[PDB]
């Protein structure tokens, strides 16, 4: 009718007509962008800019489109052309990510090559329901005495590592990662093997490099992949990276493989979300955080599940991490996450400054699953240990008056102090389950009460070497039967007697 | 939401082909007044921090230059100033 006029004057009008698959940027700022066009764009759709930068189609206004940029606001200009990838935000999954550090979007950074591709599972999928789910009935060997004994972590659980800064959270995570080496190499069957994922959010890049180096030293990257969204990276990537890690773990969960995901720290992700929200002019709330923070963390954590016998039988643990400020857990984000998890692992600065490391408190640390996430051999010992530590915590108020107090109180204090000195461990030095059982059997049978507290360290080490030389049969019998019968118990008592005989200590 | 140029006294000029934009960059017309603030249309050429003078001898400081108006703070009371007054640069 009149298109010849526009074609003549504008000199290229016919090409800017199809605004259904191509669009034009209009405004940029604060990580947000406005596009004109893209009428056929899906919500949550991935969008590709001119200079390779990407984004998420967040808001679909009547004419404009509000987009979140997975990067810095310098590779995006007003006037740039914008395309449709035609698919929701997705990330690669499967074998191929193992031993590979990647960004939030599956792009590698360790400099080793590209990554293979499945059908690229989505990121913000919905969680499972109630029927396919199953109760937790098997453990996750962490390698820490106090955790595996008193705060048992199950397989299909969501237990929280909460504590102030510089207290040994990342240490707990990396020990949990390292302890799986002997269990994985010895099986060759993916139903029993436990892979892992470590998601860093807002963490310093040097720490991530050191962690990767320490894992490569101990050969603990054949079965791990790392997802890095550090402090220099934009806020959308920190907001994503947890969801990308959970999408990578959903492959193991659905397949029937067992995987554990560690989040460092979730609070950083909450801060990034707060940033993105305030930059979208949204109304703040408590501590300036919006109301969609609970939904964020709960979307993230409800995916951790123990699938049933009919849904493959897989599992997905989750060890989220939170940094408090002066130990205040009555704050908003800690309480939001405590209402989501199935447990709690507390860490104190007093115990960490004194020397007690790992600084895992035990009166505040809890676990809803409990004994169901333990083997019988460790149940039989950890019950007595927990009871004795409760007694010690009760009667420690009057420890200075031990001379004035009865022999019962002094015996309780001695046993509690011995156990407390026994729960200590070095960094990057986990322990097998059978060794833990043997050590705690030595402890809860008064063999350490007369012994001096400081000696209990080297004692333990020596004892371990003894049972790794002659009594390997006891260890294999415990690992197979998963139980301390009277015969193995008598063998262990005989070995302990021979050990205390052959070796000298302060008492 | 309307601009000072969009009021229904000037568009009667623009629509009528009137091109009487010979009004210099020195002269402007007050558009709004309140609480010791004034908002002008014109003075395209006034500097930030510059003094301006109204019809009734009072003077003010131009602070918030904008694409459509100019924000002025008054060295006196607003009873003297009223919409439609003229403003000139010093």
């Amino acid at each position: 009718e009149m298109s010849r006029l526009l074609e003549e004057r504008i000199a290229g009008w016919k090409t800017q007509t199809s605004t259904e698959e191509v669009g034009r940027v209009v405004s940029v700022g604060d990580g947000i962008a406005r596009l004109f066009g893209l009428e056929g764009v899906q919500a949550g759709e991935l969008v590709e800019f001119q200079n390779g930068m990407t984004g998420m189609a967040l808001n679909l206004e009547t004419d404009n489109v509000g987009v979140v940029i997975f990067g810095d606001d310098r590779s995006v200009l007003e006037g740039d052309s914008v395309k449709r990838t035609g698919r929701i935000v997705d990330v690669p999954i499967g074998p191929g990510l193992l031993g590979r550090v990647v960004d939030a979007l599956g792009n590698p950074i360790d400099g080793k090559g590209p990554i293979p591709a499945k059908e690229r599972r989505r990121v913000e999928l919905k969680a499972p329901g109630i029927i396919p789910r199953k109760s937790v009935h098997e453990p996750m060997m962490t390698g820490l005495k106090c955790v595996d004994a008193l705060v048992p972590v199950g397989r299909g659980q969501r237990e929280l590592i909460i504590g102030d800064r510089q207290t040994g959270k990342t240490a707990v995570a990396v020990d949990a990662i390292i302890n799986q080496k002997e269990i994985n190499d010895s099986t060759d069957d993916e139903s029993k093997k436990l892979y892992c994922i470590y998601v860093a959010v807002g963490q310093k890049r040097s720490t991530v490099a050191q962690i990767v180096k320490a894992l490569e030293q101990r050969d603990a990257m054949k079965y791990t992949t790392v997802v890095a969204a550090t402090a220099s990276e934009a806020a959308p990537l920190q907001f994503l990276a947890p969801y990308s890690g959970c999408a990578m773990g959903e492959w193991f969960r659905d397949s029937g493989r067992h995987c554990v995901i560690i989040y460092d720290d979730l609070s950083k992700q909450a801060t990034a979300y707060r940033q993105m929200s305030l930059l979208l002019r949204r109304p703040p709330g408590r501590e300036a955080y919006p109301g969609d923070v609970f939904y964020l963390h709960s979307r993230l954590l409800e995916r951790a599940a123990k699938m049933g016998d009919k849904s493959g039988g897989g599992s997905l643990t989750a060890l989220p991490v939170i940094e408090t400020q002066a130990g205040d857990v009555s704050a908003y984000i800690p309480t939001n996450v405590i209402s989501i998890t199935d447990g709690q692992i507390f860490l104190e600065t007093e115990l960490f400054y004194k020397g007690i490391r790992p600084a895992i408190n035990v009166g505040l640390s809890v676990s809803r699953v409990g004994s169901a996430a333990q083997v019988k051999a460790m149940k039989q010992v950890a019950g007595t240990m927990k009871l004795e530590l409760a007694q010690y915590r009760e009667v420690a108020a009057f420890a200075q008056f031990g001379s004035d107090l009865d022999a019962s109180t002094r015996q309780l204090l001695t046993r509690g102090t011995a156990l407390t000195e026994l729960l200590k461990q070095r960094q990057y030095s986990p322990m097998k389950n059978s060794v833990q059982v043997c050590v705690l059997y030595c402890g809860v049978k008064g063999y350490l009460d007369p012994l001096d507290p400081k000696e209990i360290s080297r004692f333990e080490s020596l004892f371990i070497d003894y049972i790794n030389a002659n009594h390997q049969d006891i260890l294999k019998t415990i690992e197979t039967e998963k139980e301390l019968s009277e015969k193995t118990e008598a063998k262990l008592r005989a070995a302990v007697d021979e050990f205390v005989a052959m070796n000298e200590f302060k008492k | 939401k309307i601009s000072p140029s969009e009021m229904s006294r000037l568009l009667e000029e623009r629509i009528a082909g009137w091109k009487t934009q010979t009004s210099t960059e020195e002269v402007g017309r007050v558009v709004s007044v309140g609480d010791g603030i004034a908002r002008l249309f014109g003075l395209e050429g006034v500097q930030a921090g510059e003094l301006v003078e109204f019809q009734n001898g009072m003077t003010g400081m131009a602070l918030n230059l904008e694409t459509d108006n100019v924000g002025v703070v008054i060295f006196g009371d607003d009873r003297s100033v009223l919409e439609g007054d003229s403003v000139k640069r010093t």
Partner: protein
């Protein structure tokens, strides 16, 4: 009538109709979509435009998709066929046992019963818990609140009330899960299938027969958008209103946590174009709650007893949500973290807790007098906390020391080991009748138990257990 999606903002969708608009609260179905996305109308905006809240995720929607008006609000089925069956907010069962073959469906939205159609007859419940039976007696046919932060024992208390009431009820019951963990939902389903509250039977041809069940289930959990959390309690209330209206039978309704319902509005009103109130909450924080609570009420037809767990963010009871919720309750139970750190469970603060069924015209004068004496004692102990922390017990007189002893003893005595805690406590459960509680409190107040220790009252139930434990502790 067909309509078009013009705008999408998270959990909000603005739709455009050409010929005729739908009223508010009406349901709309999106056609070009994988699942059954339902939209609840909330506003009208002119230009034949409508604003809606989505009951599911909006990922995948397009500006141009087609929408169909159902002509009525959301419809949930009702009857004895919903019993022993899980149902989401839109009535769709997620139990994987077949469809719901119910004849009648009620609307999610109903006007509350009138003033004349009320009957405030005072009764009591047998919870088996010492603290509530003594100092905050629960009212048969009234609303009950459990206020607490995170990690103080609301869910355990609700499960204990289920085991001690619903199984010994005879009538019907309902459980609504509003933003709680799916894990505990599956746990409750299996515990109910165990205790016989839900009697599932698999026929030869794959069908099921829930005949004999006495409990329905409605679950809208954390893995849901806000629109699917702000409309679940209404579903449960329709399911219970059917029973106490046509059936005319008493019903028990349990809600975990109600606060989530308000929270959804908080993360919606910003998108609906509303100005925020004090703490980012909505301006509609009171009416959206009163319209939900006023539907819960005993009437001349039947009765709904309700037990609502109310979250308290950051342990702040001055927050608008619990502050508003306090006005709608007939009985209260405020849990505390300071008391849980002492190992006392249930961590009930007996001073912040209160009730309307404590007067002597309902309970006897011995019950009333014992409760008030206990409250006086605990307040007198609270009044000395500062001077004990700074100076010490030695500064106190002898009357104050006797008061402190009896107050610590009665604090520790108001601590009960439940049956459901056996999994992480080991000690067996202790049901406790009311007269035993009253006798024990009378004896502790008189001074007939000053000879005993303080740690002999911890998790013992009655007094015979306390004396036996003191005997065993003498060794």
């Amino acid at each position: 009538n067909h309509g078009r999606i013009t705008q999408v903002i998270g959990a909000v969708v603005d739709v455009h109709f050409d010929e005729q608009l739908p009223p508010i609260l009406n349901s709309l179905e999106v056609q070009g979509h994988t699942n059954r996305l339902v939209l609840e109308v909330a506003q009208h905006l002119g230009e034949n435009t409508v604003r809606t809240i989505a009951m599911d995720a909006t990922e995948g929607l397009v500006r141009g998709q087609k929408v169909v008006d159902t002509g009525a609000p959301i419809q949930v089925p009702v009857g004895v066929e919903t019993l022993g069956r899980i149902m989401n907010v839109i009535g769709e069962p997620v139990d994987e046992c077949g469809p719901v073959p119910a004849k009648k469906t009620y609307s999610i939205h109903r006007a509350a019963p009138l003033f004349a159609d009320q009957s405030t007859e005072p009764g009591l419940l047998q919870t088996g818990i010492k603290v509530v039976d003594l100092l905050a007696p629960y009212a048969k046919g009234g609303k009950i609140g459990l206020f607490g932060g995170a990690g103080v024992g609301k869910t355990v208390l609700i499960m204990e009330l289920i085991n001690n009431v619903a199984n010994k009820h005879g009538g019907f019951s309902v459980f609504a899960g509003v933003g709680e963990r799916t894990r505990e939902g599956n746990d409750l389903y299996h515990e109910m299938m165990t205790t016989g509250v839900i009697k599932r039977k698999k026929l030869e041809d794959g069908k099921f027969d829930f005949t004999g069940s006495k409990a329905a289930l409605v679950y809208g959990q954390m893995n849901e958008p806000p629109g699917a959390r702000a409309r679940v309690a209404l579903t449960a209330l329709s399911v219970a209103e059917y029973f106490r209206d046509e059936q005319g039978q008493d019903v028990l309704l349990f809600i975990d946590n109600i606060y989530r319902f308000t929270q959804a509005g908080s993360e919606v009103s910003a998108l609906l174009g509303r100005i925020p109130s004090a703490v980012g909450y909505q301006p509609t924080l009171a009416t959206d709650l009163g319209q939900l609570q006023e539907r819960i009420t005993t009437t001349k037809k039947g009765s709904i007893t309700s037990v609502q767990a109310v979250y308290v963010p950051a342990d702040d009871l001055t927050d608008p949500a619990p502050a508003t919720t306090f006005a709608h309750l007939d009985a209260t139970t405020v849990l505390s973290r300071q008391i849980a750190e002492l190992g006392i469970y249930p961590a009930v603060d007996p001073l912040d807790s209160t009730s309307r069924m404590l007067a002597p015209e309902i309970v006897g004068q011995e019950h009333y007098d014992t409760a008030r004496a206990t409250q006086k004692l605990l307040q007198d102990y609270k009044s000395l906390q500062d001077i004990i922390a700074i100076l010490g017990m030695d500064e106190l007189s002898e009357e104050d020391k006797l008061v402190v002893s009896r107050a610590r003893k009665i604090q520790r005595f108001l601590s009960q080991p439940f049956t459901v805690a056996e999994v992480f406590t080991g000690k067996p459960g202790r049901f406790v009748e009311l007269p035993e509680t009253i006798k024990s409190a009378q004896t502790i107040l008189r001074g007939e138990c000053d000879d005993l220790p303080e740690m002999a009252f911890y998790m013992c139930g009655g007094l015979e257990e306390v004396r036996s434990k003191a005997v065993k502790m003498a060794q």
